[PDB]
Design an enzyme around this catalytic site. Sequence first.
Site, PDB file in Angstrom:
ATOM      1  N   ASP A 184      47.126  48.267  22.955  1.00  0.00           N
ATOM      2  CA  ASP A 184      47.600  49.635  23.046  1.00  0.00           C
ATOM      3  C   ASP A 184      48.967  49.791  22.412  1.00  0.00           C
ATOM      4  OD1 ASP A 184      47.546  52.366  23.553  1.00  0.00           O
ATOM      5  OD2 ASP A 184      48.106  52.205  25.652  1.00  0.00           O
TER       6      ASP A 184
ATOM      7  N   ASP B 235      54.206  48.664  27.943  1.00  0.00           N
ATOM      8  CA  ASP B 235      52.892  49.057  28.447  1.00  0.00           C
ATOM      9  C   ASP B 235      51.785  48.047  28.212  1.00  0.00           C
ATOM     10  OD1 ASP B 235      50.337  50.624  28.959  1.00  0.00           O
ATOM     11  OD2 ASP B 235      51.787  52.259  29.233  1.00  0.00           O
TER      12      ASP B 235
ATOM     13  N   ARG C   9      54.337  55.438  21.279  1.00  0.00           N
ATOM     14  CA  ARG C   9      54.587  55.836  22.661  1.00  0.00           C
ATOM     15  C   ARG C   9      54.842  54.602  23.508  1.00  0.00           C
ATOM     16  NH1 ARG C   9      49.102  54.569  24.053  1.00  0.00           N
ATOM     17  NH2 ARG C   9      48.050  55.341  22.157  1.00  0.00           N
ATOM     18  N   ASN C  10      54.335  53.456  23.073  1.00  0.00           N
ATOM     19  CA  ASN C  10      54.526  52.237  23.853  1.00  0.00           C
ATOM     20  C   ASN C  10      55.616  51.281  23.365  1.00  0.00           C
ATOM     21  OD1 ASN C  10      52.623  53.079  25.727  1.00  0.00           O
ATOM     22  ND2 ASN C  10      50.880  52.153  24.644  1.00  0.00           N
TER      23      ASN C  10
END
Lengths: 305, 305
Positions: free
Chosen positions: B138, B156, B142-143
């Site tokens: 992932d 994350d 955003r991570n």
Amino acid sequence: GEAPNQALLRILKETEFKKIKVLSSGTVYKGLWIPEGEKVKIPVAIKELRATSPKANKEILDEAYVMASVDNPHVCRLLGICLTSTVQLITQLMPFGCLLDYVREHKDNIGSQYLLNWCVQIAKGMNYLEDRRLVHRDLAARNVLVKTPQHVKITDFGLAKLLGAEKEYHAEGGKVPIKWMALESILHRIYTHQSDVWSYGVTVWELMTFGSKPYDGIPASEISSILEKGERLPQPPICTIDVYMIMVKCWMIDADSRPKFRELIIEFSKMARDPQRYLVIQGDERMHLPEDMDDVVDADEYLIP
Amino acid sequence: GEAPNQALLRILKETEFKKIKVLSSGTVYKGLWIPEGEKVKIPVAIKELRATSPKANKEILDEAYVMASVDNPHVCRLLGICLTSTVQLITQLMPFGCLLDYVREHKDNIGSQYLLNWCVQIAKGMNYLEDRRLVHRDLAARNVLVKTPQHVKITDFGLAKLLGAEKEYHAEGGKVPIKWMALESILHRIYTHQSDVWSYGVTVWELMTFGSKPYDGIPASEISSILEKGERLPQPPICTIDVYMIMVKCWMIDADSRPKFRELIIEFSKMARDPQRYLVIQGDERMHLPEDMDDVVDADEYLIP
């Protein structure tokens, strides 16, 4: 809890078993059980009650009731009782004594394989007790006996309660091992299979530390507060994070978030397949663990009549 | 995959850290961690689980397991967990938040140097995860979190899987960010370090476009077909062909034809030596980017005990 308990309570003749030597002082002896005309000698532990207090006899019969109702390779086998002045509880002799002294006296020769296998065996016994809707309430290293270094069984049902087809057991008062107790038990005197899982966690920790006292400092009166503060037992040195995280999970405050015994069986069993990957112990590989007795037979091979 | 994971899982006391203000709603707080009697205050992010679903606690512990097993300057640092009614995950506070909002909120002051250095840092973190045989699954803007405009770390690990000394990871079902996924993953649910490289490519594209949504139109259900048709994300305006071709290479259908993180480190690092030659940005030169706290220390300077 609706099923009739058809266990058999065997009453034994005093003259059928010979006491060999003492084991402790209650008063446990080590001896042999020789059913008349069967040509077998069964190594046995005989716990003879000291003066008889109507309360003392009540307690020992309750233990016999529970022990007689269980039958599993990882739970202590009850042979019977003898109704003499003093009521004697006769059980299968566990030669190597309790697992707590055993890990202490043998640290230097205990490898990852033995440690993980014990965890599996205890988890199997506990899962079985849960199948029987029996909450132990006093699971600890002191209450696990050693038949052979490769075979242990859960013992001491002196506080074990059989739940009715009843979600949890509510206790009274009286001495309880607070350092092995779940939070909801120290607080609200509640006890469930899940509270047993918490105790299972502390038992594993005792094993992974080779016999250390949990919260070796803290006084019992504080344990409750410390636990509320979100604190727990420290990671044992030989423990990888894989193993410690299992323990930690057994100490969740939400009893239903804790793992199930059937799950502990699976987890430890996978690890037992490759011990050196989950427990790091110096010298792990270089380790080894262990009267005419022609007719001697272990109780595990002596079934029924 | 045969080496024992000896990471340490630290259990923290609730009373050792103060929540200052909220960050999001899971529910992340911003606070301080004050180990008792150490004279240090550590800025921290506290993710406290909302009602406890035995499933919710399972998930957060898995994250703690992964985060506790990593240690690299470009991967998020885990301080510990607190075992309260609700299980809290305590991590190093990343003041500037996630890199995705950061490039969006700061477009006008982000120069080629910062952009290329982030690419190097993320590639170093990813290379490290690959060293640990850990597939992230992932990776996205955003991570990635921002400790300072000059220092970002990958975060994350909610889907990260540790491969066994096992070539690829086969997923189940359940929500997955299809627009960042390799082809062999959307199709056959396969995931490898190379599928992570594909995700790395999309992450760079998100950065080079200052936060644009990949395939801002197309519905997730189509992404798979479009990718088969041989189509890919468009060349960002500030990108020279040197940079775009790196991205494109990360999107090859033959996973082994894609570049290796260790290679991405080298390529972006050479470019970072002369930023204006590989990213063309208007005003590039004219750009600048950034309670008694006497005893405050960043987690990166607070090691062990």
